[PDB]
Design a protein around this motif. Structure first.
Motif, short mmCIF file in Angstrom:
data_model
loop_
_atom_site.label_atom_id
_atom_site.label_comp_id
_atom_site.label_asym_id
_atom_site.label_seq_id
_atom_site.Cartn_x
_atom_site.Cartn_y
_atom_site.Cartn_z
N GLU A 102 38.62 46.09 46.22
CA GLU A 102 37.20 46.18 45.78
C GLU A 102 36.36 45.05 46.41
O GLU A 102 35.27 45.36 46.87
CB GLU A 102 37.10 46.03 44.27
N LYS B 270 38.91 52.92 42.90
CA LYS B 270 39.54 51.59 43.02
C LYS B 270 40.59 51.69 44.12
O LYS B 270 41.48 52.54 44.08
CB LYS B 270 40.14 51.15 41.69
N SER C 130 41.85 57.78 41.73
CA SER C 130 41.68 56.35 41.38
C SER C 130 40.46 56.18 40.47
O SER C 130 39.44 56.88 40.68
CB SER C 130 41.58 55.49 42.60
N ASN D 191 44.77 41.22 41.89
CA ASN D 191 43.67 41.64 42.82
C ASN D 191 44.06 41.46 44.29
O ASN D 191 43.16 41.52 45.13
CB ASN D 191 42.38 40.87 42.59
N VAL E 29 35.33 52.06 40.30
CA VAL E 29 35.23 50.58 40.22
C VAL E 29 34.13 50.21 39.23
O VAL E 29 34.20 49.12 38.67
CB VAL E 29 35.01 49.95 41.60
#
Ligand SMILES: [Ca+2]
Lengths: 271, 279, 279, 280, 279
Positions: free
Chosen positions: A203, B124, B114, B211, B117
């Motif tokens: 992201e 995502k 997915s 992440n 976001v």
């Protein structure tokens, strides 16, 4: 191969220089590929359609203008004839990387009273130089994806198409048709080309792009032989998905940029 | 070794080239390993079952289809000693390997499955903990067992450290195994044994975290030399070449918030030469 | 004397000793491992620390023993070389190279046991945050310098920490010199290798601090660290003793409750030694 | 004149001098350390700054002395080489190599003392955010150029900052030349090594800015920086003086209250010197 | 014409010219470029006007003081040909460059202007999208135009792609320019033209994103060699040396939440030698 134009009125060859010190003449070709991000209307050249999300694998029907595709071009070279053009080196960079410092147009404010959201997230930077069309292997996130008219995607996919299915062999034989998400350069082939790619997923991934006229990639193999141009044709291929552009609404579009190529060629005697 | 097929109809050898300029004959073997992420149903090949969380260490019973396993294959090579007299051993020697992960661009599909976001956003990306690992050897890969939790109860169809103890969470020298079955040795239970593998070269990077961005490179211009300091590569015992891989790319997050491992296949081009050795 | 992890007898952490002898310059390889000393709060949580406390005022900071990771060390005994030599001849074992990696890095792909879900319906939280990876090979015990976050910290029984600390102990206080002479006693947070000494050892460490730092760990049997200085001399084993030291804090494990524990792993060492003439 | 951290006498921060002399080409190694100068807001918080203020308008920005990290520096005195030589013969000490690392990097693994819990039931917040790691070895004092975030900042007594700053002082103003001639006085935020000077020193710095930047610090006694230029000449200690400079702001410590303090660490130096013949 | 930052007269940004001399004399030129971030008032030199957001592509009219521009300067060099006879051309050749950003520590001021990171916290560091770029040439830098949005209406005082089209968002070969005016070519509109600049060397890194940490190195030990494969540097054809830079360090966030670009000056040390060339 029906690629981006490299002869005629719309030719993307910017210059041809010949360096001739009596023997072993070098021909330099300067050209560019445009990105094929989907171009959802006449004004949004270099962008994709806004991204859909959360489609179940059983009902995944992406729109044509949502899918970035590989760029390719056949550059015609002077007929020599067995003497063949040999690609020796390439200088390549992404054109217009500073355009992403425009945070005033279109992008969602990062917070109240703030500037626009930079382009960021998943990116893919890829180029190839070959003496024949680039050879592709198909691999799918989801084999059941229903791909739109105007794309070429793995034929008769199966669950194995989400890993390695050796049925999915293709030539990058059409510009703006092979979706980046469906295809990679085939490491089992491309004996007559050199390819280079980096995928960075996530992201918040920052784009990092370098420009310099001092960096050269040598295309010669261990034996000192570069790609040999079959039928006097030089093939350039690229994918430069820079990241996601976020609109005020929160919708996201792929942004792509063109790639420059300077390719040094020499004449080589071959069997 | 019961590995992924490397002869017959389902063989994952894509090409064998021989380069023979009279003397220094090189045999190149081009093959691939598929990932073994757990494959929870017939449609989700290359994914794991959704991940459970917060099992107490005393009641930790992961499902088979939730555990990524190491991939391995035995490649059969021609017999060299068929036409030789006693006292002469010719062996295949692995000299170089080119390897890359196949299908890295597939993760640019942010439209299928997915979680968004944010409101009106794209899907995502696959991200988080990943492991990229390959090995080329003249014998099966040698593993050492180490467990996050020694009390974990591992399912039927997996091979995990036998009779684990608290020491199995650090170094317990009982947990020695050959990677002798494809899709059976869970990645989370096993590492290449640095105390062995004298006859193989292995390479692995673990990157942990929520992440972590996947970073994957492809090029047909990069070669790993397998020769040691003495200029000797892995030597193929019983005319067998062993390839091993684990390519857990990260976590796929569904709309629901459930998470699945995503894996990809790995390509191998291995250059071999014939080498004279004693006996 | 140094009271380290066992390197002789039944519980010896020497896995193999190989001798390579082509008539001249015989090489002895020692393969061994150190276990991490993270605090081991009960018999089942070997390789973990006690949960972390927070927000203690600097004036009332009394950390519990099992909450403090300590340095690992071991003395490896080597053959006597001067038993069969005449006076004026000193032969010493010289450490030439080391291969080292962290053992069991894949164990962190267990996201089903113990770890807090990352979000509703999600997998467990990977181990992440502040980590420290450190090893040393020496011909004598490792020499340490003390530095404290907080000089007023009151350290528990069973640890060795800077004696008579002052405010200057939070920067450089040259009183805080120690030998790493006891395994599982010198807290990592109190001590670093002394750059002003260790003339007869090589040390290597990386600290990475922060809440969300992803662990990055590599394994390969192809990477060698040369221990020779500019003059081509490695560490020389005084009293025929080889010293290995490690700290491998991999990051923080977050439980369902939100509590955090250090997680550590063992380190493998392959050390190549040769015999060297010295005055 | 340079009034630095003590490098002779009782409080000397020279830990060892080793001489390696096989008849010819004697090497002298000097082992020393610099302490960080983070501001030291009280006698117990050595190595920390005062808590950070925020949101001062550029027109009313008066930072407190103990809030400003300053550059560290010291003059190391070396033996005279010319006492028993005749006229026209100049021997000088030449800095050839330096090994340097930050001392006490593991101290940041104390997450039990002072730091705000990361969440309910969690450990303390690691030190993180904006950091600056810098060192210099020279044969003369380090030469600085001033650059200011805000030229209107009013700097406190006990600091030396750009004199008569202007809007141009926020970019390049060539008036702001100084010698790093006082330890614990030149605020890091005001000064950089002057790339236009320092012909007789080698300097090295990395700034990493941001809220969540992880500290990354390496230690090893196997890594050496060569100080020789393209001609094979290191810094020359012209009045038999060797100058070491450092700034090692490791990041921000966050207290339970949410207040933030800079945390700094000392830097070790091992400098290898040789005697070099120089022209009159 | 190139109307750059002054490099002669009272306001000259040449700090020193040194000559190192019997035969192959080297001339070193030490100079700096100031950043051109927009300078919204007399006190905010090195900053831009606060950034607007969310302008529709059809109504995008950015203010002059909001747009960072490329810096450039023409440095005049001595004539070498004044005492030579015709058919003999001596030219200055740029051999090496040392360059760094000046004042990187200024970003450790977290007390002035910046929004607190949280209640009772220090100011928010400068962070986000940055661009660091420099060029050394024997002629003006040659630019290619590329636009985020071709319909952007650029203010008086800027030079931007003339008669842009949708293709101006990718490659439009109409948009060729010389960097012939300091503080006029907006960074967001222009890049160095890889199809030209045969007589200059350029180097640039763009890093985009909200939370990107600035990473800036200073050292007087790092040199960029400007010689091509044939050992020839940029040749200063009319005794003119051209330096160009863009150093957008990131975004400054005020208490209000408004954002401004922050830029810094770049130092250049360029080593030149005399080179004999054909007329
Ligand atoms: Ca010493």
């Amino acid at each position: 191969v029906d690629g981006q134009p490299m002869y005629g009125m719309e030719s993307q060859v910017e210059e041809v220089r010949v360096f001739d010190t009596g023997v072993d003449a070098i021909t330099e070709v300067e050209c560019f590929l445009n990105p094929e991000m989907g171009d959802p209307d006449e004004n949004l050249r270099g962008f994709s359609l806004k991204l859909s999300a959360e489609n179940d694998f059983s009902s995944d029907s992406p729109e044509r203008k949502m899918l970035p595709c590989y760029s390719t071009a056949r550059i015609p070279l002077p007929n020599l004839n067995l003497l063949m053009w040999e690609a020796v080196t390439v200088q390549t960079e992404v054109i217009g990387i500073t355009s992403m410092l425009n945070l005033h147009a279109g992008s969602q404010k990062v917070h109240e009273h703030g500037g626009g959201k930079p382009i960021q997230g998943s990116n893919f930077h890829f180029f190839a130089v070959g003496g024949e069309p680039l050879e592709m292997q198909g691999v799918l996130m989801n084999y059941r994806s229903k791909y739109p008219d105007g794309t070429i995607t793995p034929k008769n996919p199966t669950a194995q198409s989400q890993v390695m299915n050796t049925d999915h062999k293709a030539y990058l034989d059409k510009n703006n048709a092979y979706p980046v998400e469906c295809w990679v350069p085939d490491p089992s082939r491309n004996e007559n080309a050199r390819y280079f790619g980096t995928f960075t997923g996530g992201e918040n991934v920052p784009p990092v792009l370098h420009v310099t006229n001092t960096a050269t990639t040598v295309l010669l193999d261990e034996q000192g032989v570069g790609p040999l141009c079959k039928a006097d044709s030089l093939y350039v291929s690229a994918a430069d998905i820079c990241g996601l552009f976020t609109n005020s609404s929160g919708t996201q579009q792929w942004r792509g940029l063109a790639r420059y190529f300077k390719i040094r060629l020499r004449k080589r005697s071959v069997k």
